Design a protein around this ligand. Sequence first.
Ligand code: SF4
Ligand code: SF4
Ligand code: SF4
Lengths: 628, 628
Amino acid sequence: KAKSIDQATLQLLDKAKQDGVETVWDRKADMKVQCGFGSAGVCCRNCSMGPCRVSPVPGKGVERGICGATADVIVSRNFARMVAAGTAAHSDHGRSIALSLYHTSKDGDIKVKDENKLKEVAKSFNVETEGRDIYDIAHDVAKEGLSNYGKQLGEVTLPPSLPEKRKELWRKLGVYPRAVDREIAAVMHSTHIGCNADAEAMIKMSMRCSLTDGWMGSFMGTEFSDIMFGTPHSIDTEANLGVLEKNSVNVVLHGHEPLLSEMVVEAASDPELVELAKSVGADGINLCGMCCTGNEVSMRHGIKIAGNFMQQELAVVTGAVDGLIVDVQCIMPALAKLSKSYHTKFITTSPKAHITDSIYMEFDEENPLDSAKKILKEAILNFKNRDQSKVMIPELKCKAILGYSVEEIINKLDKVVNTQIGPMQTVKPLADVLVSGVLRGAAAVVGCNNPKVVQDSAHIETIKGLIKNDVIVVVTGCAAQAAAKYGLLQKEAAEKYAGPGLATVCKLVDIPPVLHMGSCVDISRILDLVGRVANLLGVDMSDLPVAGVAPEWMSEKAVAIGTYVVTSGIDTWLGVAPPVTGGPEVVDILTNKMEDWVGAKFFIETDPHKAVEQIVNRMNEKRKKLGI
Amino acid sequence: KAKSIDQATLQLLDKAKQDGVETVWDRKADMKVQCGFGSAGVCCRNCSMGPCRVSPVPGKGVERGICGATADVIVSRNFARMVAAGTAAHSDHGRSIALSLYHTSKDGDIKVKDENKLKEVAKSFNVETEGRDIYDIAHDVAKEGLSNYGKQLGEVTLPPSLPEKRKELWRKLGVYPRAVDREIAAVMHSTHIGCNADAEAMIKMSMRCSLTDGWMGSFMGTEFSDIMFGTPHSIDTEANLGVLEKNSVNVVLHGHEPLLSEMVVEAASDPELVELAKSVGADGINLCGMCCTGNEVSMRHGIKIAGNFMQQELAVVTGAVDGLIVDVQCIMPALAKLSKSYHTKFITTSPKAHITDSIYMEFDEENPLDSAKKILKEAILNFKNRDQSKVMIPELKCKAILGYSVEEIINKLDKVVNTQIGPMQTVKPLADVLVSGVLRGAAAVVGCNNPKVVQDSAHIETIKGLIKNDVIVVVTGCAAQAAAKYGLLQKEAAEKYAGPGLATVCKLVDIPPVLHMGSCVDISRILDLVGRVANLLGVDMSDLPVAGVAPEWMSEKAVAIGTYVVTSGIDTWLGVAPPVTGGPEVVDILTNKMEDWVGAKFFIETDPHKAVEQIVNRMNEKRKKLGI
Ligand code: SF4
Ligand code: SF4
Ligand code: SF4
């Protein structure tokens, strides 16, 4: 089968074959037929009595592990641990952001750039703002956010966009969230040998844990990032590997933590570093981003996006990356080995993400700007080691428009508001187009790449089908970057791909049919948007014609995201089967019984066209339930 | 191979074969040859690009996972997740204890029974005590303990017995602990795909996480349990399955959390329940404990111990267990199936541990005594369903002495203190016998059973070898219960098994050669003891001739325990190989490089006699280093 639908990706794969280096595709081929027990989730290693593998087919073979655990128990515990790991990644990101907020000052490297957003957040956290210093408010807000992570007494703080009905449903079901780290610890405790051996209770614990990601960790990370670095607005950028410059220093920012990439962007305008780049024979400094850190700097500053997850290696294969600076998460360790075949300096910066044989330059949060400057200086000085005979940059780049935060979307919707009617600054125009049926619904396309799927194929096919069916699409993460590379993040795309109702809406509001809402933590924005719509219509989020899709997901973070999206009341389609087919009870809970609990459920569909059809049918069913 | 060295265990295995019921031994046999990849730890399932298996033999076969992770990376992440799971179990136990402390009242079900212990703990937590109400002090202490779990700013609180040198070494190494749930979340975050791919850093993160178990979670759980339920003192009890009564109601308490078992013990003396037991035709109520909850109630009240981990099923096989009340952890789910073959009521009580097809009676912490009375009444009423023709109780039980908390040990040591010299109430006599060489050292024997080892064989052989070599032995958990069943927890055992120096010490102090220090969380007591000795000698804990042994461990909790014991500076022998042989770098870190870091290291030895020899040699070389 084809490795990708992206032509630049294919050219660089040919180059990697010529250079004798191996990619993620090569390692996937080397893995050959993957273990059936692990693929079905019926393998357990939770204690040293094991490893235990039970039959994925009930009634045949070994039925129980040594402790007596059934296939359903093993599957449910494995699924819960995936959710806990994803929640941990997102919560650690949000915790770093909250600590950065706590260390803001007027004359420091980290300031408050959006005071209005900070005051609204302070209102949401019961922090007084009138007649107060802005940084005192910021510190109080950071304290409340940090308490959300580890409070042992009392209730956590949740955003006002979350409907009261959803909160009450969670409380009745027993999944109402506690402090984030406490929920992670609870999931890890209940999967220990000889604890929870009941699939339904295990799934409910995992949902409870995922809620602390969706509504607390990711939400606080996003809002505090907006406070410190600015709320995203409509902004132009370029996407795909063609953004690399042969005649300039190329600095590629990979990872998830935004403070480092923000400081690197600021350092790139330093006169001394620009002069140094000129002195090493380069035209200038060309910052490019990848994955979620690329999404953040692109949403807030228009930094060009070099590529998504499965392109990271190919960025090095060009031979033009002088410095690859990585913080945490979704950083293929093979990059270190790959960097030996080129001049590239592979720089790790976080104590959480040491990588063997990489150059470690710890990013100092006490002096973020100076630390970023020294890291960037190492990248710039590496330009002298460039071998221009090994350089091949495909001439394939695509224009994209992004920056669609909830605030930006509301500002855009204000155009189609009659002044004599109003109100202004609400999601009411969006609610109106959804209720009238001009738009059939809204769908979030999120997730990673996965060698099991032709890279970016499922993302593009799902998005095109949805917008052709007058479903407005919001995108995050690597799916958003696939849309950017393909060219869907363009106003022209409305008349090229969208159906009649969505084309009319795009023309009236002057937006692309596909709205890039940011990184994987920025999925919280999607929640926020949906919540607002629900609160405007006086219904729960499970009554709306909305859906989420993860066509090509790979990460534990994706598992946690899908779990909290379903728990919030939004049906979720998974384009890659999770390792649960071995447990019939777990499959039945996730795809059938979940609808009785939270009004939504998982859909597993590896065919994107069938997924689009199912999404449209489900949205029409919910519309008929709602009367619209 | 023999299944056990215990004769009562063998008789009940014959009965289980005659009854056509499966045991843990039968399921282990059914599992046959366990997966080599999982056994070596070279299998990874951390993302849905996998499952990935790399060769346990370097230089052959597949070398890297799909993301590029090496065998060392996969092994180190798997080990770290085991540590995180064990830390989560212990920390959740301690968190429940702290919450119970927070709800103590003068006229409530949960009171303060050891005010002196509470005042000393309050001193350790910087809580004022002079001229204050005892329950105000208790609530402040509980608040400080709870803050240890989830504080995001500042430093955690550690017991005064921990040497300053050990803390400084931890700070220099980068493993100084943070809040417990924060460290669990950090480990889970760094094992996520594309985060940490460096074995040394991964092992250091796991050590940092395990410290929050050893010195914060388990320590606080133990000390708060002492405050609420009484400090253990020397007390007599009986051990092994013979403690069951044919003519009495048999109520078996299995699990770890002590509040429920304490309330059940209190409810058993209720006049209405005793009258009800008489009216259902029984002579009375016979409470028996298993595993750690049995250890707690036995340490504090002399409740008879029915058996350790791999005996739990056999307790039901007797046909005499009218009620089996379980809370969390090390509860084989197969019990639910097994109790169908008998009249036994298998009662789950904790929302953390639901077991399918068991009778769920949620233990209400708000009204603990009434809830315990209701559960106990269900067990008593089940006596009418006893089938006395199916009853077979082995006439095999053994006298044991336990209750050796640090306070009790100090009280015993006061006997050999010359009044004209002093001081009293210190560990000085123990330090003196260790320094003079009358005792060669002290060894902690802890851990579970494991079907991979003849049950209780390794525990007994290791303990007998150590005490024969004039090494005083402290025991916890299932190892302590194996010693109890065998008969080592007896004063007579001193003259039957101990060497000359240990026999003299036992005669002078009037103690058994093997000291039962309580449950698995009570391993913190061992730490406390060692710390005191170190603080009395002005040395670090790694300079002492001390060691820890886990001859037959199975649980993730055991992994976390061994990790924090080694990190504290105490060499640890493992009688069951952990899944790390596939990563040569991880093996080298755990067994060789750890000594450079923390002055102690792991020893993997499956032969108990060889383990005893190695322990004696290591203790002698540490003595020669210390000059004693
Ligand atoms: S999933 Fe289990 S059975 Fe399959 S290779 Fe991995 S450890 Fe072995
Ligand atoms: S927890 Fe149970 S099923 Fe899992 S490895 Fe241990 S004995 Fe086997
Ligand atoms: S994290 Fe890497 S090694 Fe582990 S399953 Fe995913 S791709 Fe394979």
